[PDB]
Design a protein around this ligand. Structure first.
Ligand SMILES: [Mg+2]
Ligand SMILES: [Mg+2]
Ligand SMILES: [Mg+2]
Ligand SMILES: [Mg+2]
Ligand SMILES: [Mg+2]
Ligand SMILES: [Mg+2]
Ligand code: NA
Ligand code: NA
Ligand code: NA
Ligand code: NA
Ligand code: NA
Ligand code: NA
Ligand code: NA
Lengths: 1011, 1011
């Protein structure tokens, strides 16, 4: 039969799901979580062969190794070994939508391994094999004999091999199918790969075994008393001498223990479970678990005899915590949580979707290091090790079932179909059966983007019945259906409603008070970090903090799903949709992370970190008020550093330790600060530093900061009188001003400064001209698919209006000789099809000091789309190594994403003034700059700017960052005003009104000089 | 693969479930529900071959018929043809509890059929086959080619045969397995049969078709306006020219009609169902549907081109009614229901589990004629025609999923197992998709006796989601779990609690008000009608009428599940558990009905009819108050017949028209009644008569009655003085009294009247002795499983105390000659192992009138189990044809079951005084009798009695009624007192206290004379 084309058959001869087992045969080894000789890893080099379809697989393969097969490493995704192309499609299914059928051309991966077992495993006991991850379906053979079949690429499939094992060499044969009916439930926006991408192992258990166990913790009103209730289930022959003992450990101390024979209480007219027993342990003043302080206990479950003989032991870490929704609030150990989360896929630039401990630890450290306290398993059960790390490092987790049918029409066609309830149910139930003992998991999720069907309600209720300890949520069908305890929309904006029919996305503040609504609101997804994004991020946090029931959300998302390819020379580059011949494909939509595929941060990460700080500050006079947003921990590893500076010049500082309790305040009085009479603005910058290193951070780690303007003393002194006076030389074609060894040349035909000289060295490679456009950011383009011409998108509106093709018509270009300077006045009008888009009026004043004062006043037609920017740009001949400036920095910041930037004197290498977004666009800008220094140049004013070796044009025409070439000289963009980058989503205009350049008339001035 | 041993595989290539289809190609035919040429019946003579296992089936069977095969009628269960034996087991599974495995020796039934198909059917469209019922799993082949597989013995399985058929002759091959994993979900307390026991048919549908349609009716606050919403789904070629027209008909009048193109409203981000359409029709002052008045409309669903081409039409009967639970009450069209229901199994004594129209109509007419208005489909979806009849005749239906795992341990082992969820959901989901359009179905049931598992919660929620028009109920796990909207216990008693651990059965009155409880309570099972039962029935109805939230229940059950067998003389007799060599079995527990398998009424039926009357009466002086319990109808077919009688002698009578509004009252003043001077008790008897015939009753049908004692005149006149005086003759052995032609002989050794003579003929075959025991009724024995002795059972307490073997010891026997009579005085003590159980003191007075007054005074030890009865018995030499008595009658009646009986002068043939209960026991009693006439004898007093040709001993020793043999003469049992029969359940003592003979001392008198 073709079991991969029948949702009625999701497995064959597969063992029941259960919590992580190791079948320890020694209680001390179990308590310390040390290795168990009964659990073996079969990871390593396997024999692999690729085929176009399962029909092409030679039967001989079942009996012996095919000489054509290659020796590859397992786990792995065969697209990563180059056997075929990984595919990046977002919504549209990778295969023709015709359930339950799949294409006859079904890439088949044939894996095989020769191995042998310990003599004792042949004598007695149950030997089972475990495949943590097989994408997407597979058949299994042992020593030529068929064992079973399994589906669901994200949960373990186990099979009893006891009756197939033989002395000597044994051979596993695994036929993996890329496509199956299960693929209809795995349409997540990500790379479509396949193979055995997760661990493979052998577990040896006794015939009379622990087949399952559940750990629960209930508390009293103040959590000073708890009861640990453990239900243990067994398989095999029941016998009166059998006992179960559950002991609770805190380090090497046993705080509580419980022993009892099998035989549960009576549950109905036929009695109770003779094969189960529930132990109840009293725990006084338990140490509570939270992301803040991940206190953990160790629970050891022993199946032994009444007279002391251990049969086998299983165990897990225990975190005493209560998760409950009360009066509209999500409470953890009685406190309202504020979710600082992120959605994280299991992605690796080299290994594809194969995860490893090192990578997970790296993600967790970066996350906590950037003030995240939660993560969503978008959109499937993760690698088993992820939960252990979260339990221990401290991260709230949303465990999500591997069910996504985004590409269906309507989205709920399958999920509302009773005939898919079985397949759907196993993806939900097997997840809960596997992860329910993990304390880090505080919320169960029924999946992602599958509309809202009756199957969702059925499964919602099942969980509620089986595990009342955790709330259940699901966004599909409107984010507030009868299948979710939490209003969990994706991309709902703060103040703006999006009244979509049927599934509107109300402003989150409004959503809360809709007639009858009482549930808490936590976005399952928000702040789409695709490329230069996260504009308006602070708006979300201001709302989260002011509204009790707005309890945060999970950013989308953690890491760019870009893959690594190599060119002719063997140099690596970041590839995305379509770069593998995969088509249809959705281009760069697979990259929406706060970090690059190699975990290098994007500028946006700093903004998230800043807005997600755990300490709030207020300033009044000499007093700084520090408020703690921690719910449980006291600030026992923090000291406040404060420094006052005048225009970047340090003037005073000092440190004060932080002794603030959760939700508490601390008043800090700053001493008398010297009185600077020197013109300038005084700035106060404070930062919280962690003097001691921790499991997730180094000593000196900065966890928060904030800036304030103190006193400002305006300059009322005039500059030194000009000894000399510049001379003007006229020509029909040019206006030349000369002073000392400096020369300025204004082209009378274009009306632009076309050249400058310091001695005989040219300064410009391209004239200084106005600029009202920018290389479109992913948010300006707006498309979740590589096949959509959207006229509503900003980039499209700018093209239709001719912003990118507007030619500068000169209206006026005059020159006047003044008492101590030359005044050049110009006026241009950018038009397109007889329509004047903008009008620019300027005056250039050059005095005897050699300083060029540029005054600019622009007019923007009210009926033309608001411009991307209002400023000037040119290509300097110069190419220096440093960029020194007095403004917001040191990292890239934009109008609607600069709260994390600080005002000060920054000095960086030129390359750092460039942000390597895989998909090139406007980047590296820095706002609130009062002074910019490059080479012999200095510009003064109050402007925004970016500077690099790439022109706006090149960035605009280049698809991949690796294809960018450094242009001659340096490109400079000085903006008086720049449009917001937005980010609420990346497929519709998202730049908030206050950040759109719509004033109609703009003014800004600059001073250009040398030295 | 052995799919019949895999709960993961419940079907292969089966079509989706849907409501009844006929695929008319003419709307008028659809409207009239006339036969459809596109719907053929394949019922008739098939070829059948029996095998001991599927592996024994020869391959040649697929290609052609087998020589040894026989020609049988289908549908049918092969056990009814004698191929193997039917098994009657209650709780214990008929197979070894080892899921999902069945015995390797699994009886296999090979059915085959060579049928014809017109090429017209193959020229276009889809040709499918439909099996309405295959027990319990099967594989299907058409023309030697494999088609599919299916499970669930109670719901239709459909397969597309389009590509397997050919013009002309075709052959089907159906391999039916008796056992499968599905059997673990079909452990209902009934006969375990198998085969194709329901209709088989062939349906033709065009390629573009109506694949499903839902009809719903919502109303305004007063039901004066309504909206009919019909959602229609299509399959095939979806084009813009497609339309659906739903028209509503009331007879030949089209009341409403709607037409629209396909394309449902937007439901989610991907759009909506382009293959669906919802029609909404307004209906003013709709005629409401109810069991009282089954008003129906006809809905025709036309799939057609916009231009007028009918592709095909489907249809159904529509009942406009709302079913909702509000404030604790179950409401039908806004009024609280009083469920007068009964559980009914699909059983036939000759055909087993095969249902036919005639039988169904017979059950329905009998049920309504006996004031039943509801029925529970215990415990599986019923034959499709059942719902049509209930819709049309008017009966509230509880549709129940085919799920019972009673035999598991604990009962919820499979239902709480997520691995059995798939199999369970299909039994529930496919039931709803098939019957959701029938108005008679008002409640969905999740199954029966399967404990309460998480799977129950998920499916409960599923129904609430797909169909919010009907409450969902389920008794498992305690009758009040989170999986039921109605508290629906089985056998919960009216006042007495039964605090069982985990799943107690509280007194229904108490259950309603337990802290926090608010739901209505309707017993899914109560008043176990096993054998001589229904004692205490009136107690349930008094409560139902007094407590608003006690809304009735379903009696258990309708018809005895006895099967017909024949003796060597070819005569038929009723058989039960074990009568077919079936072992283990539960003998007679399969017979618990109000009627025999041939639908002959048990005496209990009348008690049910009486207590379930729709008119209540109250008497005050000469005014009779009638109160209607009807919720929607006026008494437009009822008249009141009243009659007054003096000890059976009718004095006055008359008719009065009944004009009562629903829930209304009517006062009727009786005319000046006569005032007879003659001694006696005046009795008033009123009967509600239906003058006109109905679809369910004949003219003259009596639907209710009631009696009252009016004025009484105690006889104070002395009997004429006797001329003569009896002569006494003494001897050591006897006391012989003589008067005229009458003689009496009292044995001086036994102390009993050993013989009498009328004229000169003997009158006794056995002496007149005391009796304190009775042939145990099913309720005295109690053992739902013949493999469970029980000391607590009444029969066991009586035996242990020696009630059945105690011998009378003479304490005294004297004779005295009075002035006008002879007085015999006796005393007896019944003992057992030195214990005195009872003491009987009597006096026999024989005067000159030839009469014999017997005075009896009994003492019963307080520490001996209360006696079954306290009276006298003897074997009359006479065998008369008639029995005439003044007292309760005419049918059998006992202390706790005599409310239906009426006091009057009854006269019946001897045979009617015996109730042919299949399992013999005490029977035919009649209480409140003041006079009994049999042959030349007459007995006067105030007693209870039974009279027949069978001795309590024979009844007690015989297992089947056909084994009973008339004894010489007639056995007479005259009781001063008789214990109640009980019936609340048949497996534990249920006779209420007030009906137990515990007074310690009893007195009664009788006068024997020759009339
Ligand atoms: Mg499958
Ligand atoms: Mg998606
Ligand atoms: Mg120990
Ligand atoms: Mg099966
Ligand atoms: Mg049962
Ligand atoms: Mg018409
Ligand atoms: Na909040
Ligand atoms: Na994406
Ligand atoms: Na501190
Ligand atoms: Na670009
Ligand atoms: Na009631
Ligand atoms: Na029964
Ligand atoms: Na009437």
């Amino acid at each position: 039969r073709r079991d991969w084309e029948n949702p009625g058959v999701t497995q064959l001869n597969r063992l029941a799901a259960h919590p992580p087992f190791a079948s320890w045969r020694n209680s001390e080894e179990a308590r310390t979580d040390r290795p168990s000789q009964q659990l073996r890893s079969l990871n390593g080099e396997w024999r692999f062969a690729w085929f176009p379809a399962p029909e092409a697989v030679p039967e001989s393969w079942l009996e012996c190794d095919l000489p054509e097969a290659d020796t590859v490493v397992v786990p792995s995704n065969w697209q990563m070994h180059g056997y075929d192309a990984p595919i990046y499609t977002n919504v549209t299914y990778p295969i023709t939508v015709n359930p339950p059928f799949v294409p006859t051309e079904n890439p088949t991966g044939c894996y095989s391994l020769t191995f042998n077992v310990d003599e004792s495993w042949l004598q007695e006991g149950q030997t089972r094999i475990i495949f943590d991850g097989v994408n997407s379906a597979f058949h299994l053979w042992c020593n030529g004999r068929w064992v079973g079949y399994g589906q669901d690429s994200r949960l373990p499939s186990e099979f009893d091999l006891s009756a197939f094992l033989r002395a000597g060499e044994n051979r596993l044969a695994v036929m993996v199918l890329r496509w199956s009916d299960g693929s209809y439930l795995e349409d997540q926006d990500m790379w479509r790969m396949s193979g055995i991408f997760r661990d493979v192992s052998l577990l040896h258990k006794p015939t009379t075994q622990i087949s399952d166990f559940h750990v629960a913790t209930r508390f009293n009103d103040d959590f000073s008393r708890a009861v640990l209730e453990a239900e243990v289930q067994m398989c095999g022959e029941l016998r009166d001498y059998l006992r179960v003992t559950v002991s609770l450990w805190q380090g090497e101390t046993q705080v509580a223990s419980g022993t009892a024979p099998f035989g549960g209480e009576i549950i109905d007219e036929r009695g109770g479970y003779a094969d189960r027993v529930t132990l109840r342990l009293n725990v006084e003043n338990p140490k509570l678990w939270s992301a803040e302080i991940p206190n953990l206990y160790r629970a050891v479950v022993e199946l032994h005899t009444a007279d002391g003989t251990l049969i086998e032991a299983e165990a897990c870490d225990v975190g005493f915590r209560e998760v409950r929704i009360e009066n509209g609030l999500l409470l953890l150990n009685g406190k309202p949580l504020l979710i600082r989360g992120v959605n994280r896929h299991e992605h690796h630039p080299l290994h594809g979707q194969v995860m490893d401990e090192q990578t997970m630890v790296q993600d967790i450290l970066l996350m906590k290091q950037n003030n995240f306290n939660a993560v969503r398993c978008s959109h499937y059960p993760n690698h088993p090790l992820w939960y252990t790390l979260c339990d221990r490092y401290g991260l709230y987790v949303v465990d999500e079932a591997n069910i996504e049918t985004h590409g269906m029409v309507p989205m709920n066609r399958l999920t509302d179909d009773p005939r898919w309830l079985p397949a759907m149910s196993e993806r939900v139930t097997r997840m809960v059966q596997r992860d329910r003992n993990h304390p880090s998991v505080i919320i169960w999720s029924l999946g992602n983007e599958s509309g809202h069907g009756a199957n969702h309600d059925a499964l919602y209720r099942w969980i509620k019945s089986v595990d009342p300890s955790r709330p259940v949520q699901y966004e599909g069908g409107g984010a507030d259906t009868t299948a979710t305890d939490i209003i969990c929309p994706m991309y709902a904006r703060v103040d703006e409603d999006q009244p979509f029919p049927a599934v509107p996305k109300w402003s989150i503040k409004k959503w809360l008070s809709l007639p009858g609504e009482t549930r808490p609101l936590i976005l399952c997804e928000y702040a789409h970090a695709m490329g230069n994004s996260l504009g308006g991020f602070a708006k979300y946090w201001q709302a989260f903090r002011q509204y009790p029931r707005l309890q945060g959300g999970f950013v989308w998302d953690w890491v760019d799903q870009s893959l690594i390819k190599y060119d002719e020379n063997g140099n690596p580059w970041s590839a995305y949709g379509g770069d593998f011949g995969d088509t249809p494909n959705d281009a760069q939509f697979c990259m929406n992370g706060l970090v690059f595929a190699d975990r290098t941060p994007h500028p946006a990460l700093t903004e998230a970190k800043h807005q997600q700080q755990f300490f709030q500050f207020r300033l009044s006079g000499q007093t700084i008020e520090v408020t703690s947003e921690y719910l449980f921990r006291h600030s026992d590893n923090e000291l406040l550093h404060w420094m006052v500076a005048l225009d970047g010049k340090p003037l005073a500082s000092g440190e004060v330790p932080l002794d603030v309790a959760p939700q508490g305040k601390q008043l800090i009085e700053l001493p008398e600060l010297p009185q600077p009479e020197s013109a300038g603005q005084l700035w106060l910058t404070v930062r919280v530093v962690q003097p001691n290193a921790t499991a997730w951070s180094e000593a000196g780690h900065i966890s928060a900061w904030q800036q304030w303007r103190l006193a400002e003393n305006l300059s009322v002194t005039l500059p030194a009188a000009s000894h000399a006076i510049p001379h003007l030389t006229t020509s029909e074609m040019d206006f030349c001003i000369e002073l000392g060894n400096k020369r300025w040349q204004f082209n009378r035909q274009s009306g632009f400064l076309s050249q400058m000289w310091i001695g005989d060295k040219k300064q410009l490679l391209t004239p200084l001209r106005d600029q009202f456009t920018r290389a479109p950011l992913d948010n300006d383009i707006g498309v979740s698919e590589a096949t959509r011409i959207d006229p509503n998108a900003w980039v499209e509106r700018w093209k239709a209006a001719g912003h990118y093709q507007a030619e500068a018509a000169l209206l006026q270009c005059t020159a006047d000789t003044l008492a101590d300077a030359v005044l050049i006045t110009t006026a241009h009008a950018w038009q397109h099809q007889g329509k004047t888009l903008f009008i620019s009026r300027k005056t250039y004043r050059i005095d005897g000091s050699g300083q060029m004062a540029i005054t600019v006043d622009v007019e923007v037609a009210s009926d033309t789309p608001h411009p991307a920017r209002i400023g000037l740009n040119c290509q300097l001949a110069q190419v220096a190594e440093r960029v020194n400036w007095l403004g917001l920095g040191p990292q890239e910041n934009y109008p609607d994403r600069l709260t994390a930037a600080c005002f000060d004197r920054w000095d960086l290498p030129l390359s750092d003034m460039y942000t390597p977004y895989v998909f090139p666009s406007e980047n590296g800008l820095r706002c609130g700059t009062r002074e910019l220094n490059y080479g012999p140049h200095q510009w003064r004013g109050d402007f925004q700017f970016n500077i690099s070796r790439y022109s706006q044009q090149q960035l605009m025409e280049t698809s991949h960052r690796h294809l960018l070439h450094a242009e001659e000289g340096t490109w400079l963009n000085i903006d008086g005003f720049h449009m917001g980058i937005g980010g609420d989503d990346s497929w519709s205009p998202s730049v908030s009104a206050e950040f759109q350049l719509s004033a109609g008339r703009y003014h800004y001035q600059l001073v250009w000089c040398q030295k």
